């Protein structure tokens, strides 16, 4: 009957079109801040001196980019890991020159996507569900925090964060391979098994349900009209799908339990993305992937090359050409 | 509650290992990430000043200082890509600092041979290495068997602190649902969504 209790009843109401909740009190202002700043910076933002060497990189559509080449460029290397809000910048043009919008978007996005995760817990609690959908969303949240926050922290600069652009993402990937050999890191290998396996199991589970649908339609209408929303009966023969996949490989290698099967669909990509998020987070502190350069040696002592050595020649080509004016000394220790 | 608290401590102890050289002295743990790249910029400042370069006026390729530039707050710092690590306060470089940053006459005149040694092993034992403990950058060859203890301590405890935050999310979601009484699933008799308004 009080004013706060009527506000609490509206915030936690499951009858709103979108659930707000108390995490939405952090989710909606931070993500709409980051969305507003991203759209304005992607369309029209002046070039950013990313490498701190007064060589400004254009990233917006009004400075000659397209959708692929356009980016919100990371902060200046001269800033480093320093906090650069607008009020610490003496003019907005100085803030725009030094890659200020990147720090505003990334910090509001990472706060807002952690609050999106807690909002996913919160609605499940108000709906009487089991809680752990937001644990599955923690795997892309850990990945976003690794490339936007954790890898800047270990390298000591927001300039080494992943650019908010399509071609900036590929620039982030190639320099990471030259400096950390992520392909030879087993945590990226588990991540590739997470997304190759996850899209395998998605196409596998989606095939066997669609293969074993029960006749409820004619040849003229769509097959999806055989399902009614809110029906209690099963819409596909799971015995027929188990008998198919049990004959495709062999019988003992197939889930007859649909609850164990859907748990395996949740676990395989999420654990795979968790591990590759802890690959980026541990290559942030330069615990790099496997180095097998000049490891095969013949009897005289000469180096016999392997495929890791040919991979090393491609790593050498990226690292001698990346940030080509930024280096003054023979080791890229940053 | 403890899983959330011990995850926050694990992230903190990792960055202790990576950044702090007071409670984690660099004579014991090796140089920090910031410390090793300032040791490189210090080494080639000493290398080139012996060859007669006036290192305070030496222009780099971009027009900034090759050896000595200025921080965004105004302090005289080391030039190059190590301008991001200008907050580094190692004990072998603080003897050359005045209030304005690095003192130019103390760099020109009184640089001690222990400082040139200290920066030399810190340059060559940077916290950069592989999982099979090959020292150096990812393009280095297999001769040096080294990964910094700072890199082992930070990476392991960043790995552990994330998964203990996953444990906070698991166990707090479960304990909140087990206390309310629907952690085993939805009651078929009274499903909560069915007794709600149409949602549009």
């Amino acid at each position: 009957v009080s004013l706060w209790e009527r506000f609490c009843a509206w915030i936690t109401s499951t009858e709103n079109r979108l659930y707000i909740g108390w995490f939405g009190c952090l989710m909606f202002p931070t993500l709409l801040t980051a969305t507003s700043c991203f759209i304005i910076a992607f369309i029209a933002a002046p070039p950013v001196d990313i490498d701190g060497i007064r060589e400004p990189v254009a990233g917006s559509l009004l400075y000659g980019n397209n959708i692929i080449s356009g980016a919100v460029v990371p902060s200046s290397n001269a800033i480093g890991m320093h906090f650069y809000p607008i009020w610490e910048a003496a003019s907005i043009d100085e803030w725009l020159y030094n890659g200020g919008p990147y720090q505003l978007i990334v910090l509001h996005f990472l706060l807002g996507v952690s609050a999106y995760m807690g909002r996913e817990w919160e609605l499940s609690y108000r709906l009487g569900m089991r809680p752990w959908i937001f644990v599955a969303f923690s795997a892309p949240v850990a990945a976003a925090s690794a490339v936007f926050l954790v890898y800047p922290i270990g390298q000591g600069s927001f300039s080494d964060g992943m650019p908010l652009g399509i071609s900036g993402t590929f620039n982030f990937m190639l320099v990471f391979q030259a400096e950390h050999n992520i392909l030879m890191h087993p945590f990226h290998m588990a991540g590739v098994a997470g997304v190759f396996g996850g899209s395998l199991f998605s196409a596998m589970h989606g095939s066997l349900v669609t293969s074993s649908l029960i006749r409820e339609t004619t040849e003229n209408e769509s097959t999806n009209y055989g399902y009614k929303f809110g029906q209690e009966e099963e819409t596909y023969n799971i015995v027929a799908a188990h008998g198919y996949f049990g004959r495709l490989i062999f019988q003992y290698a197939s889930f007859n339990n649909s609850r164990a099967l859907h748990f395996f669909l949740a676990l395989w990509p999420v654990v795979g993305i968790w591990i590759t998020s802890m690959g980026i987070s541990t290559m942030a502190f330069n615990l790099n992937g496997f180095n097998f350069n000049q490891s095969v040696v013949d009897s005289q002592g000469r180096v016999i090359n392997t495929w890791a050595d040919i991979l090393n020649r491609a790593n050498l080509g990226i690292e001698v050409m990346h940030e080509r004016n930024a280096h003054n000394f023979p080791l890229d220790l940053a | 509650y403890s899983l959330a608290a011990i995850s926050l401590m694990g992230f903190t102890a990792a960055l202790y290992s990576w950044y702090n050289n007071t409670a984690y002295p660099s004579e014991l743990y090796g140089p920090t990430g910031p410390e090793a790249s300032q040791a490189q910029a210090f080494t080639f400042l000493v290398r080139d000043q012996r060859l007669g370069a006036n290192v305070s006026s030496a222009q780099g390729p971009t027009g900034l200082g090759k050896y000595l530039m200025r921080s965004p707050s105004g302090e005289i710092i080391f030039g190059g890509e190590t301008m991001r690590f200008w907050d580094l306060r190692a004990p072998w470089v603080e003897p050359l600092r005045g209030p304005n940053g690095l003192d130019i006459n103390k760099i020109k005149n009184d640089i001690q041979p222990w400082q040139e040694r200290r920066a030399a092993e810190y340059m060559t034992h940077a916290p950069l290495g592989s999982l099979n403990s090959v020292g150096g950058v990812a393009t280095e060859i297999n001769s040096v068997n080294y990964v910094s203890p700072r890199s082992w301590l930070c990476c392991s405890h960043f790995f552990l602190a994330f998964f203990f935050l996953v444990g906070h999310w698991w166990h707090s979601g479960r304990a909140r649902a087990a206390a309310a009484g629907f952690e085993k699933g939805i009651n078929r008799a009274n499903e909560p969504v069915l007794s709600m308004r149409p949602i549009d």
Partner: peptide
């Protein structure tokens, strides 16, 4: 001039997302 096309395609894509969320066909039982 092509940035006019790039802006219109992105803003036009977000307008489809707006109508897909708030003008969706409501799922109804029976």
């Amino acid at each position: 001039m092509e940035a006019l096309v790039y802006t219109f395609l992105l803003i036009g894509t977000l307008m489809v997302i707006f109508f897909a969320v708030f003008f969706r066909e409501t799922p109804r039982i029976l």
